[PDB]
Coordinates of all heavy atoms in Angstrom, one line a residue:
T1 N 33.7 15.2 -0.9 CA 32.9 15.9 -1.9 C 31.6 16.5 -1.4 O 31.4 17.7 -1.5 CB 32.6 14.9 -3.1 OG1 33.8 14.7 -3.9 CG2 31.6 15.5 -4.1
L2 N 30.8 15.7 -0.7 CA 29.7 16.2 0.1 C 29.9 17.5 1.0 O 29.1 18.3 1.0 CB 29.0 15.1 0.9 CG 28.1 14.0 0.3 CD1 27.6 13.0 1.2 CD2 26.9 14.6 -0.5
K3 N 31.0 17.5 1.7 CA 31.3 18.6 2.6 C 32.1 19.8 2.0 O 32.5 20.7 2.8 CB 32.0 18.1 3.9 CG 31.2 17.2 4.8 CD 31.8 15.8 5.2 CE 33.3 15.8 5.5 NZ 33.6 16.3 6.9
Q4 N 32.4 19.7 0.7 CA 33.4 20.7 0.2 C 33.3 21.1 -1.3 O 34.2 21.8 -1.7 CB 34.8 20.3 0.5 CG 35.5 21.0 1.7 CD 36.9 20.6 2.0 OE1 37.3 20.7 3.2 NE2 37.7 20.3 0.9
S5 N 32.4 20.7 -2.0 CA 32.2 21.0 -3.4 C 31.1 22.0 -3.6 O 30.2 22.1 -2.7 CB 32.1 19.7 -4.3 OG 32.2 19.9 -5.7
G6 N 31.1 22.9 -4.6 CA 30.0 23.8 -4.9 C 28.9 23.0 -5.6 O 27.8 22.9 -5.0
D7 N 29.3 22.4 -6.7 CA 28.4 21.5 -7.5 C 28.6 20.0 -7.1 O 29.1 19.2 -7.8 CB 28.9 21.8 -9.0 CG 28.1 20.9 -10.0 OD1 27.0 20.4 -9.7 OD2 28.5 20.8 -11.2
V8 N 28.0 19.6 -6.0 CA 28.1 18.3 -5.5 C 27.4 17.2 -6.4 O 28.0 16.2 -6.7 CB 27.5 18.1 -4.1 CG1 27.3 16.6 -3.7 CG2 28.4 18.8 -3.1
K9 N 26.2 17.5 -6.7 CA 25.4 16.6 -7.5 C 26.0 16.3 -8.9 O 25.9 15.2 -9.4 CB 23.9 17.1 -7.7 CG 22.9 16.4 -8.5 CD 21.9 17.3 -9.2 CE 22.5 18.5 -10.0 NZ 22.0 18.6 -11.4
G10 N 26.7 17.4 -9.4 CA 27.3 17.3 -10.7 C 28.6 16.4 -10.7 O 28.8 15.6 -11.7
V11 N 29.4 16.4 -9.7 CA 30.6 15.5 -9.5 C 30.1 14.1 -9.4 O 30.7 13.2 -10.1 CB 31.4 15.9 -8.2 CG1 32.5 14.8 -8.1 CG2 31.9 17.3 -8.3
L12 N 29.1 13.8 -8.7 CA 28.7 12.4 -8.5 C 27.9 11.8 -9.7 O 28.1 10.6 -9.9 CB 27.8 12.3 -7.2 CG 28.5 12.7 -5.9 CD1 27.4 12.6 -4.8 CD2 29.7 12.0 -5.5
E13 N 27.2 12.6 -10.4 CA 26.6 12.2 -11.7 C 27.7 12.0 -12.7 O 27.5 11.1 -13.6 CB 25.6 13.3 -12.3 CG 24.2 13.2 -11.9 CD 23.4 14.4 -12.3 OE1 23.6 14.9 -13.5 OE2 22.5 14.9 -11.5
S14 N 28.7 12.8 -12.7 CA 29.8 12.6 -13.7 C 30.5 11.2 -13.5 O 30.7 10.4 -14.4 CB 30.9 13.7 -13.7 OG 32.3 13.0 -13.6
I15 N 30.7 10.9 -12.2 CA 31.3 9.6 -11.8 C 30.3 8.5 -12.1 O 30.6 7.5 -12.8 CB 31.7 9.5 -10.3 CG1 32.9 10.4 -10.1 CG2 32.0 8.1 -10.0 CD1 33.2 10.8 -8.7
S16 N 29.0 8.7 -11.8 CA 28.0 7.7 -12.2 C 27.9 7.4 -13.6 O 27.9 6.2 -14.1 CB 26.6 8.0 -11.7 OG 25.8 6.9 -11.7
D17 N 27.8 8.4 -14.4 CA 27.7 8.3 -15.9 C 29.0 7.7 -16.5 O 28.9 6.8 -17.3 CB 27.3 9.7 -16.6 CG 25.9 10.2 -16.3 OD1 25.0 9.6 -15.6 OD2 25.6 11.4 -16.8
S18 N 30.2 8.1 -16.0 CA 31.4 7.5 -16.5 C 31.6 6.0 -16.3 O 32.3 5.3 -17.0 CB 32.6 8.2 -16.0 OG 32.6 9.6 -16.1
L19 N 30.9 5.5 -15.2 CA 31.1 4.1 -14.8 C 29.9 3.1 -15.1 O 30.0 2.0 -14.9 CB 31.4 4.0 -13.4 CG 32.7 4.7 -13.0 CD1 33.0 4.6 -11.5 CD2 33.9 4.1 -13.7
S20 N 28.8 3.6 -15.6 CA 27.7 2.8 -16.1 C 27.6 2.7 -17.6 O 27.4 1.7 -18.3 CB 26.3 3.3 -15.5 OG 26.2 4.7 -15.6
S21 N 27.9 3.8 -18.3 CA 28.0 3.8 -19.7 C 29.3 3.1 -20.3 O 29.6 3.5 -21.5 CB 27.7 5.3 -20.1 OG 28.1 5.6 -21.5
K22 N 30.0 2.3 -19.6 CA 31.4 2.0 -19.9 C 31.4 1.5 -21.3 O 30.8 0.5 -21.5 CB 32.1 1.0 -19.0 CG 32.6 1.6 -17.7 CD 33.5 0.5 -17.0 CE 32.8 -0.4 -15.9 NZ 31.6 -1.1 -16.5
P23 N 32.1 2.1 -22.3 CA 32.2 1.5 -23.6 C 33.1 0.3 -23.7 O 34.1 0.2 -22.9 CB 32.8 2.6 -24.5 CG 33.7 3.3 -23.5 CD 32.9 3.3 -22.2
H24 N 32.8 -0.7 -24.5 CA 33.7 -1.9 -24.6 C 34.5 -1.9 -25.9 O 35.5 -2.7 -26.0 CB 32.7 -3.1 -24.5 CG 32.2 -3.2 -23.1 ND1 32.9 -2.9 -21.9 CD2 31.0 -3.7 -22.6 CE1 32.1 -3.1 -20.8 NE2 31.0 -3.6 -21.2
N25 N 34.2 -1.1 -26.9 CA 34.8 -1.0 -28.2 C 34.6 0.4 -28.8 O 33.8 1.2 -28.2 CB 34.3 -2.1 -29.1 CG 32.7 -2.1 -29.2 OD1 32.1 -1.1 -29.3 ND2 32.2 -3.3 -29.3
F26 N 35.1 0.6 -30.0 CA 35.0 1.9 -30.6 C 33.6 2.2 -31.1 O 33.1 3.3 -30.9 CB 36.0 2.0 -31.8 CG 36.2 3.4 -32.3 CD1 36.8 4.3 -31.6 CD2 35.6 3.7 -33.6 CE1 37.0 5.6 -32.1 CE2 35.8 5.0 -34.0 CZ 36.4 5.9 -33.3
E27 N 32.9 1.2 -31.5 CA 31.5 1.3 -31.9 C 30.6 1.9 -30.8 O 29.8 2.8 -31.0 CB 31.0 0.0 -32.4 CG 29.6 0.0 -32.9 CD 29.2 -1.2 -33.8 OE1 30.0 -1.5 -34.8 OE2 28.1 -1.8 -33.6
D28 N 30.9 1.5 -29.5 CA 30.2 2.1 -28.3 C 30.6 3.6 -28.2 O 29.8 4.3 -27.8 CB 30.6 1.4 -27.0 CG 30.0 0.0 -26.9 OD1 28.9 -0.3 -27.4 OD2 30.7 -0.8 -26.3
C29 N 31.8 3.9 -28.5 CA 32.3 5.3 -28.4 C 31.6 6.3 -29.5 O 31.2 7.4 -29.3 CB 33.8 5.4 -28.6 SG 34.8 4.6 -27.4
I30 N 31.4 5.7 -30.7 CA 30.5 6.4 -31.8 C 29.1 6.5 -31.3 O 28.6 7.7 -31.4 CB 30.5 5.5 -33.0 CG1 32.0 5.5 -33.7 CG2 29.5 6.0 -34.0 CD1 32.1 4.5 -34.7
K31 N 28.5 5.5 -30.8 CA 27.2 5.6 -30.2 C 27.1 6.7 -29.2 O 26.1 7.5 -29.2 CB 26.7 4.3 -29.6 CG 26.5 3.2 -30.7 CD 26.0 1.9 -30.1 CE 25.8 0.8 -31.1 NZ 25.4 -0.5 -30.3
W32 N 28.0 6.7 -28.2 CA 28.0 7.6 -27.1 C 28.1 9.1 -27.7 O 27.3 10.0 -27.4 CB 29.2 7.4 -26.2 CG 29.4 8.6 -25.2 CD1 28.8 8.7 -24.0 CD2 30.3 9.8 -25.3 NE1 29.2 9.9 -23.4 CE2 30.1 10.5 -24.2 CE3 31.1 10.2 -26.3 CZ2 30.7 11.7 -24.0 CZ3 31.8 11.4 -26.1 CH2 31.5 12.2 -25.0
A33 N 28.9 9.3 -28.7 CA 29.1 10.6 -29.3 C 27.8 11.1 -30.1 O 27.3 12.2 -29.9 CB 30.3 10.7 -30.2
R34 N 27.2 10.2 -30.8 CA 25.9 10.5 -31.5 C 24.8 10.8 -30.5 O 24.0 11.7 -30.8 CB 25.5 9.3 -32.4 CG 24.2 9.4 -33.1 CD 24.1 10.5 -34.1 NE 22.7 10.7 -34.6 CZ 21.8 11.4 -33.9 NH1 22.1 12.1 -32.8 NH2 20.6 11.5 -34.4
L35 N 24.8 10.1 -29.3 CA 23.8 10.4 -28.4 C 24.1 11.7 -27.7 O 23.2 12.5 -27.4 CB 23.6 9.3 -27.3 CG 23.0 8.0 -27.7 CD1 23.2 6.8 -26.7 CD2 21.5 8.1 -28.1
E36 N 25.4 12.0 -27.5 CA 25.7 13.4 -27.0 C 25.2 14.5 -28.0 O 24.6 15.5 -27.5 CB 27.1 13.6 -26.7 CG 27.6 12.8 -25.4 CD 26.8 13.1 -24.2 OE1 26.7 14.3 -23.9 OE2 26.4 12.1 -23.5
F37 N 25.4 14.3 -29.3 CA 24.9 15.2 -30.3 C 23.4 15.4 -30.1 O 22.9 16.6 -30.0 CB 25.2 14.7 -31.7 CG 24.7 15.6 -32.9 CD1 25.6 16.5 -33.5 CD2 23.4 15.6 -33.3 CE1 25.2 17.3 -34.5 CE2 23.0 16.5 -34.3 CZ 23.9 17.3 -34.9
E38 N 22.6 14.3 -30.0 CA 21.2 14.4 -29.7 C 20.9 15.3 -28.4 O 19.9 16.1 -28.4 CB 20.5 13.1 -29.6 CG 19.0 13.2 -30.0 CD 18.8 13.5 -31.5 OE1 19.8 13.5 -32.3 OE2 17.7 13.7 -31.9
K39 N 21.6 15.1 -27.4 CA 21.3 15.7 -26.1 C 21.6 17.2 -26.3 O 20.8 18.1 -26.0 CB 22.1 15.1 -25.0 CG 21.8 15.6 -23.6 CD 22.9 15.1 -22.6 CE 22.7 13.6 -22.2 NZ 24.0 13.0 -21.9
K40 N 22.7 17.6 -26.8 CA 23.2 18.9 -26.7 C 22.6 19.8 -27.8 O 22.4 21.0 -27.6 CB 24.7 19.0 -26.8 CG 25.4 18.2 -25.7 CD 25.3 18.9 -24.4 CE 26.1 18.1 -23.4 NZ 26.0 18.8 -22.0
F41 N 22.3 19.2 -29.0 CA 21.9 20.1 -30.1 C 20.5 19.8 -30.6 O 20.0 20.5 -31.5 CB 22.8 19.9 -31.3 CG 24.3 20.0 -31.0 CD1 25.1 19.0 -31.2 CD2 24.8 21.2 -30.4 CE1 26.5 19.1 -30.8 CE2 26.1 21.3 -30.1 CZ 26.9 20.2 -30.2
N42 N 19.8 18.8 -29.9 CA 18.4 18.6 -30.3 C 17.6 18.7 -29.0 O 16.9 19.7 -28.8 CB 18.3 17.2 -30.9 CG 16.9 17.0 -31.4 OD1 15.9 16.7 -30.7 ND2 16.7 17.2 -32.7
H43 N 17.7 17.7 -28.1 CA 17.0 17.7 -26.8 C 17.1 18.9 -26.0 O 16.1 19.5 -25.7 CB 17.4 16.5 -25.9 CG 16.9 15.2 -26.4 ND1 16.5 15.0 -27.7 CD2 17.0 13.9 -25.8 CE1 16.1 13.7 -27.9 NE2 16.5 13.1 -26.8
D44 N 18.3 19.3 -25.6 CA 18.5 20.5 -24.7 C 17.9 21.8 -25.4 O 17.4 22.7 -24.6 CB 20.0 20.7 -24.4 CG 20.5 19.7 -23.4 OD1 19.7 19.0 -22.6 OD2 21.7 19.5 -23.3
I45 N 18.0 21.9 -26.7 CA 17.4 23.0 -27.4 C 15.9 23.0 -27.4 O 15.3 24.1 -27.1 CB 17.9 23.0 -28.9 CG1 19.4 23.2 -28.9 CG2 17.2 24.0 -29.7 CD1 19.9 24.5 -28.4
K46 N 15.4 21.9 -27.6 CA 13.9 21.7 -27.4 C 13.4 22.0 -26.0 O 12.3 22.5 -25.9 CB 13.5 20.2 -27.7 CG 13.5 20.0 -29.2 CD 13.0 18.6 -29.6 CE 13.0 18.5 -31.1 NZ 13.0 17.0 -31.4
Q47 N 14.1 21.7 -25.0 CA 13.8 22.1 -23.6 C 13.8 23.6 -23.4 O 12.8 24.2 -22.8 CB 14.8 21.4 -22.7 CG 14.5 21.6 -21.2 CD 13.3 20.9 -20.8 OE1 13.2 19.7 -20.9 NE2 12.3 21.6 -20.3
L48 N 14.8 24.2 -23.9 CA 14.9 25.7 -23.9 C 13.7 26.3 -24.7 O 13.1 27.2 -24.2 CB 16.3 26.2 -24.4 CG 16.5 27.7 -24.5 CD1 16.4 28.2 -23.1 CD2 17.8 28.0 -25.1

């Protein structure tokens, strides 16, 4: 990945985020989705 990807940092953050945030039940999956709502439609907009 280091020697051959365009977006190197993005591949390794996707792996990091997929394996630290690991949901244990459906309720964790709801939480994760709600926080993604916050990031994409509140936070990221505020940053812009």
Side-chain angles (χ1 to χ4, degrees):
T1 288
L2 285 175
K3 290 128 44 77
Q4 258 182 212
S5 193
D7 182 18
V8 166
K9 178 212 52 129
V11 175
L12 300 179
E13 269 171 43
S14 125
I15 291 160
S16 195
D17 291 359
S18 307
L19 298 177
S20 47
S21 160
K22 274 191 266 57
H24 293 325
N25 53 42
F26 190 73
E27 181 162 313
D28 292 325
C29 298
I30 292 167
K31 290 180 183 177
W32 168 83
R34 175 68 192 82
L35 288 167
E36 287 306 308
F37 182 98
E38 208 68 9
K39 184 189 284 150
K40 298 287 181 182
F41 310 119
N42 187 284
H43 292 12
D44 287 342
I45 296 296
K46 286 185 180 158
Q47 185 65 63
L48 180 61

